[PDB]
Ligand binder design. Structure first.
Ligand SMILES: [Mg+2]
Ligand SMILES: [Mg+2]
Ligand SMILES: [Mg+2]
Ligand SMILES: [Mg+2]
Ligand SMILES: [Mg+2]
Ligand SMILES: [Mg+2]
Ligand SMILES: [Mg+2]
Ligand SMILES: [Mg+2]
Ligand SMILES: [Mg+2]
Ligand SMILES: [Mg+2]
Ligand SMILES: [Zn+2]
Lengths: 166, 108, 152, 148, 275, 287, 132
RNA sequence: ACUGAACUCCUCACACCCAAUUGGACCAAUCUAUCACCCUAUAGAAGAACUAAUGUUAGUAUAAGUAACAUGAAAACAUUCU
């Protein structure tokens, strides 16, 4: 098995020079062996990707899926450790940069069928990962307007060359 | 009927990452003025409702102790009085349920 | 097609639906406040109002007594229905029940509702209160009202 | 295949032939082993041919390192910064000579598909064709069906 | 486990290669890598350029003042290339001016100065030094060598060539290694200008010629989003130059640029440089 | 030139900001206790004269930041971006409080200031515009008013519907810009230095310096625009959602100079009004 | 430099967690500058362990950063005057004198203020509970 | 007239397009002899090479988060009701 996500919190950067932008804080947290399908967990992860910590918590508090409570607990733990140990000034000044669900170690069981035949149930377990980055959530990628999109078209037209000749 | 070919991960992603399947963002979440916990606009605050349910459970335990047995529903009104409270003029002729705690602020 | 069908299909059939509503309504009469799945509460609200009306009809009315006897499985509530609830609402003409939505049941995430009889002794629910009249929008609308009143 | 491989355009390093020809190869490094059948050819090359090549190519610095080695190698560094490493493992003296001569005559550009066998910085002398070449003009520049 | 060593060694080599590609080490000056002898490298530099450099002069050219300062600071716990670089830069500017004036007598002094500045600029000189291996032999206190220091070292090398072989050989060197850099380059790609129409008007005034009349020679797709306008500048009803564009203003500006090119004799089909 | 006047006023503003910041160097921890109904008992150790009630809301949660418009530091209304001075008790006031009157007044003042900025940067160069004052009118009045003296060349000119709509478009551009409401407690001397040209603002500054015990005056800046504030303002302009410069009425008693009152109306994002109600409010905001 | 190997021999085991626990995953730029008054012993006491109290009034510098190299305590350049009462202990066969504990008197001046603002949450009340 | 092949010419290079079968030149990896000593050489050997046997074992996919499964009601969780 791999446990690199936990190690990711132990990387120490060298001191920044005074004339350098303040490096945003980053907190890697995860919960391993959640009794929940990674496919079902992925929907919640995608839902909360890119949102502020408070908005993500609000969205998860009112979600009926079982994984919502687990993700909320993980996010709360991440916030607590970010404030205590990663020198994050404000609780709410955090946004979910990364949130993914990983397959866990699963167990195989037998499902009895009608005519003495059987199938192999898998007691599915999944991991859950979050990276919390300090600072306001990045603005959503604005949809490309007609002006810029026609600009792209004209650039493509100009890029044309006389192919297969001198 | 059995599948004729394994469905590729590309097709499966196209299917199961569709917006129709993605979880929709709720925009009716608000902060309860009373306690500041999160609630939905059309739903009662969970925290405040838990307060009310716990106080109701205590009052109902007192009611059960007073009644003392099944099928003992009173034929008269009921009034809940807390420590340091006395039945008022309209509270006369109504069964009194005594609570050992002080009057809650939200209760009136 | 269910155009105009006003009764939900609950339980194991019509009789089972009636019995489920009967149990819910008996609990409502006993406790003056009940939590139950939102659909069942919505279905039982009308029957609660109808029981209040039958109680208003009077203790001595044979039809009202029979209806109460059927609808209250615990017979100790019939005196309560005829001597507490009905006198309480004698002034009112309707709206004896207050129904509100509650956070979904943790067990199965069912849509939950709390239904109570108005004027009960239990602690008040966190009712939704409209915005204060002193808000910016409400004060502007108050200005509208005053100007319209003065002009016409 | 071409689609599964990078491609470039035929080019020189610094217009290598315009003013004068500058040999692009600048450094050769032969890692050879005193003992080992693999580097017998490399040893013979160092004994007999490396000096002649060195004096024939004064612009190339040649280093010879005798080190315990199971696979003798020649590393060629060109002026443009390219580095090409070729194993001379079990190569005869003539094979090593030809390989070294090819490295000397080669340029530092990558050996990948070349899109065109030619490269002109001034492809046109009479004016690159445009739709209005060969099209006669009209009085007052009146477009077809123009009233005035 | 499978008995054997060769497959394991190969896999270790592949893992090392992938690790290096993913996280390449910080760049290191070639001097610090194996197989480096400064004297042989500098001699090979001279022989590669086919010029009989004086070794001491070339060493003094390759050594920089900042390197001397860093070396002295380290020693706490040599002649720089300043004069050689100054001489080389001065001679290079004068010789490039001579070349350009001889090749394009109609080019104005401003254009000649701008072309010389382009040829001796940080970008072009840095590219030439990088592909001539001056950077490898450059002694500097920081790596990669900054473009300013690289340019200074290259001009110091030119000055050393001047002091060793003479003005004629140095001029040949410049013609070979800087005049070639404008091959394929466009006049206004090398000399940035603003208001080419105004500059052309000035030039015609100097030549005692009336201001050109901009006139629409050809047109296509006027009302579309991809128009083509060919605009010609007419002098006393005589076409001097016509240029295309997307809008009429752009076409006129480009026609002015073409007219300037023709007047200065830097047309695309001009006589190629002689070597 | 007006651009030069704005540049020098902003320079003085920044000079005063830096002067106060230097006067308050290092970091002194001040204890501010949340006395609000929710999350009671929380305590924030804050940088003296650096942190803000907005920073306290940042510590609390994002909902506090988004919903809180004012702060009652020790019972007095403080702008959400006004630096805190001493250990105190803080309570956040939103638009939907039981008694949001103070928040309404702050919103009214902020909208008036935005209108003043739009007016000052609307007219053409030749005409001269002098912002006399933002009269403090009740919200019941149905419109926030800003008083301006226009040039004698325009004393006979009344804005058209298109001109009013252009004013609204400029105000909406400001709202989209979403500039914070920077605040300063600046001594009357520096305030008069900043506003020396504007006689009306000079006398208003003198009046405020007389009213308050000391000569401390409230200067406020949205962007490149500095004005004397009758009180605390909104944190940011993006709080405004609906905004409409409704009318311009020429005050009847104007012998010396013609004072025009620009009347407008706005509603924050928290209190959006439906289209029809908004139209009726606009109609009533032209009196 | 986080030279825990030498710190183990330089400080007592009772002191090492205090020396190194809270400073994990953060760079410290502690530096020394000339002392102000000569260090002198204060008192000594005593299977058998030595004990020596030394009073120092020196001048020092701090710059404690985060995992991300952003300063969070003290200026790196400006030095401060430090009054410390350092207690050494010794094992009595091969043990030496190592820092055992720093005694901070109640009258000592408050230390340097923190750079980041902090919050101290009040009682997280359950529904039945009410704030007091 | 032109277009038109792997035919033919042209610059360079040539053993480098037939099933079963047959001849030949090389060779991956392993061990042994002796070398070598950042991966090898000359030889001797052999469990010496897998895109295919509804091949065997193990892992994980697809079908699929689908088929299918489950807890009578309220409540003081005492208790009561159907
Ligand atoms: Mg069986
Ligand atoms: Mg059913
Ligand atoms: Mg053909
Ligand atoms: Mg043939
Ligand atoms: Mg086999
Ligand atoms: Mg295989
Ligand atoms: Mg197989
Ligand atoms: Mg699946
Ligand atoms: Mg299906
Ligand atoms: Mg089913
Ligand atoms: Zn609440």
């Amino acid at each position: 098995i791999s446990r690199k996500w936990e190690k990711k919190n132990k990387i120490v950067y060298p001191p920044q020079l005074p004339g350098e932008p303040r490096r945003p804080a980053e907190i890697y947290h995860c919960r391993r062996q959640i009794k929940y399908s990674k496919d079902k967990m992925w929907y919640l992860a995608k839902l909360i990707r890119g949102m502020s910590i408070d908005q993500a918590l609000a969205q998860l508090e009112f979600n009926d899926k079982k994984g919502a409570k687990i993700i909320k607990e993980v996010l709360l733990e991440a916030q607590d450790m970010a404030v205590r140990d990663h020198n994050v000034e404000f609780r709410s000044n955090l946004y979910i940069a990364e949130s993914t669900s990983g397959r866990g170690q699963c167990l195989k069981r037998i499902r009895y069928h009608g005519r003495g035949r059987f199938g192999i149930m898998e007691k599915v377990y999944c991991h859950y990962f979050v990276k919390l980055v300090e600072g306001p959530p990045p603005p959503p990628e604005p949809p490309k307007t007609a002006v810029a999109h026609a600009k792209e078209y004209i650039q493509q037209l100009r890029s044309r060359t006389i192919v297969h000749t001198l | 009927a059995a599948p004729k070919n394994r469905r590729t991960i590309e097709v499966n992603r196209c299917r199961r990452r569709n917006p129709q399947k993605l979880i929709k963002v709720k925009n009716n979440i608000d902060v309860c003025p009373e306690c500041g916990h999160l609630k939905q606009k059309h739903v009662l605050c969970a925290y405040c409702y838990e307060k009310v349910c716990k106080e109701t459970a205590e009052i109902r335990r007192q009611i059960g102790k007073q009644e003392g047995g099944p099928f003992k529903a009173p034929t008269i009104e009921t009034v809940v009085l807390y420590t340091g409270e006395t039945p008022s003029e309209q509270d006369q002729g109504k069964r009194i349920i005594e609570r050992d705690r002080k009057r809650p602020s939200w209760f009136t | 097609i269910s155009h105009g069908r006003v009764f939900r299909r609950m339980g194991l059939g019509p009789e089972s639906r009636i019995h489920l509503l009967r149990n819910l309504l008996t609990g409502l009469v006993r406790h003056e406040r009940i939590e139950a799945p939102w659909a069942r509460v919505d279905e039982m609200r009308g029957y609660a109002e109808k029981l209040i009306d039958y109680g208003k009809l009077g203790d001595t009315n044979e039809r009202a007594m029979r209806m109460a006897d059927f609808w209250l499985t615990e017979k100790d509530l019939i005196p309560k229905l005829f001597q507490v609830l009905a006198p309480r609402y004698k002034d009112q003409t309707g709206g004896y029940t207050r129904m509100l939505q509650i956070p979904n049941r943790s067990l199965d995430r069912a849509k939950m509702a709390v239904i109570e009889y108005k004027g009960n002794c239990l602690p008040p629910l966190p009712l939704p209160r409209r915005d204060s009249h002193l808000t910016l929008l409400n004060q502007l609308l108050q200005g509208l009202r005053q100007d319209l009143r003065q002009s016409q | 295949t071409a689609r599964g491989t990078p491609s470039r355009f035929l080019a020189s390093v610094l217009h290598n032939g315009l003013g004068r020809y500058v040999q692009q190869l600048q450094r050769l490094s032969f890692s050879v082993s005193r003992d080992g059948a693999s580097s017998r050819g490399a040893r013979e090359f160092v004994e007999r041919e490396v000096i002649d090549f060195a004096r024939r190519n004064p612009g190339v610095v040649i280093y010879v390192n005798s080190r315990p080695c199971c696979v003798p190698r020649v590393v060629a560094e060109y002026l443009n910064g390219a580095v090409r490493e070729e194993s001379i493992h079990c190569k005869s003296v003539e094979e090593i000579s030809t390989l070294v001569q090819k490295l000397a005559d080669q340029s530092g550009l990558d050996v990948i598909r070349i899109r065109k066998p030619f490269h002109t910085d001034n492809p046109s002398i009479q004016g690159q064709w445009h739709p209005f070449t060969n099209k006669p003009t009209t009085f007052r520049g009146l477009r077809p069906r123009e009233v005035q | 486990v499978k008995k054997g060593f060769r497959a394991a060694f190969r896999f270790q080599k592949e893992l090392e290669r992938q690790r290096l590609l993913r996280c390449p080490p910080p760049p290191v000056r070639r001097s610090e890598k194996p197989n480096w002898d400064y004297h042989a490298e500098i001699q090979a530099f001279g022989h590669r350029l086919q010029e009989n450099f004086s070794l001491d002069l070339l060493k003094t050219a390759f050594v920089n003042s900042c390197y001397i300062k860093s070396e002295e600071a380290k020693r706490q716990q040599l002649k720089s290339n300043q004069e050689l670089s100054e001489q080389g830069t001065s001679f290079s500017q004068t010789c490039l001016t001579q070349f350009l004036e001889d090749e394009y007598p109609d080019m104005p002094t401003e254009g000649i100065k701008n072309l010389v500045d382009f040829l001796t600029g940080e970008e072009v000189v840095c590219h030439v030094a990088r592909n001539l291996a001056v950077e490898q032999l450059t002694l500097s206190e920081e790596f990669p060598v900054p473009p300013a220091v690289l340019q200074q070292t290259f001009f110091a090398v030119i000055g050393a060539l001047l002091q060793s072989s003479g003005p004629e050989r140095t001029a040949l060197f410049i013609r070979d290694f800087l005049i070639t850099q404008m091959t394929g380059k466009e006049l206004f790609e090398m000399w940035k200008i603003i208001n080419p129409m105004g500059l052309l008007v000035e030039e015609l005034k100097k030549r005692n010629v009336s201001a050109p009349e901009s006139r629409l020679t050809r047109q296509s797709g006027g009302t579309t989003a991809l128009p083509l306008y060919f605009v010609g500048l007419y002098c006393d009803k005589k076409l001097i130059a016509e240029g295309p564009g997307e809008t009429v203003l752009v076409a006129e500006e480009e026609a002015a640029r073409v007219a300037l090119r023709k007047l200065y004799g830097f047309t695309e089909n001009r006589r190629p440089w002689n070597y | 030139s007006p651009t030069e006047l704005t540049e020098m006023r902003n320079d003085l503003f920044n000079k005063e900001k830096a002067r106060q910041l230097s006067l308050t160097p290092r970091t002194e921890k001040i204890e501010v206790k949340h006395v609000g109904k929710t999350d009671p008992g929380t305590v924030f150790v804050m940088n003296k004269n650096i942190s803000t009630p907005y920073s306290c809301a940042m510590h609390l949660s994002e909902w506090y930041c988004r919903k809180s418009i004012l702060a009652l530091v020790d019972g007095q209304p403080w702008d959400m971006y006004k630096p805190l001075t001493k250990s105190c008790e803080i309570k956040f006031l939103t638009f939907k409080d039981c008694d949001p009157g103070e928040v309404n007044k702050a919103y009214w003042r902020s909208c008036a200031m935005m209108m003043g900025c739009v007016i000052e940067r609307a007219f053409k160069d030749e005409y001269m515009v002098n912002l006399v004052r933002a009269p403090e009118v009740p919200v019941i009045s149905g419109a926030f008013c800003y008083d301006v003296v226009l040039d004698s060349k325009l004393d006979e000119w009344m804005p058209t519907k298109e001109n009013l709509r252009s004013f609204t478009k400029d105000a909406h551009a400001l709202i989209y810009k979403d500039l914070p409401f920077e605040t300063l407690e600046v001594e009357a001397k520096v305030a008069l230095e900043i506003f020396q040209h504007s006689k009306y603002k000079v006398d208003f500054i003198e009046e405020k310096a007389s009213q308050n015990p000391e000569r401390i005056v409230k200067l406020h800046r949205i962007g490149d625009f500095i004005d004397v504030s009758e009180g605390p303002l909104i944190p940011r302009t993006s709080i405004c959602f609906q905004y409409e410069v409704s009318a311009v009425h020429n005050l009847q008693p104007t012998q010396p100079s013609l004072i025009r009152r620009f009347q407008g109306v706005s509603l924050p994002v928290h209190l959006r009004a439906h289209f029809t109600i908004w139209d009726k409010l606009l109609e009533r905001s032209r009196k | 430099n986080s030279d825990h190997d030498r710190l183990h021999t330089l400080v007592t085991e009772h002191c090492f967690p205090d020396m190194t626990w809270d400073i994990k995953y953060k760079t410290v730029r502690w530096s020394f500058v000339e002392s102000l008054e000569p260090s002198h012993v204060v008192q000594v006491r005593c299977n058998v362990y030595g004990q020596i109290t030394v009073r120092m009034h020196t001048r020092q510098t701090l710059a404690i950063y985060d995992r991300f190299g952003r300063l969070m305590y003290g200026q790196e350049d400006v030095p401060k005057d430090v009054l410390e009462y350092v207690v050494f202990e010794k094992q009595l066969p091969y043990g030496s004198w190592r820092m055992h504990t720093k005694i901070v008197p109640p009258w000592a001046p408050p230390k340097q203020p923190i750079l980041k603002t902090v919050m101290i949450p009040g009682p997280q009340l359950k529904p039945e509970e009410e704030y007091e």
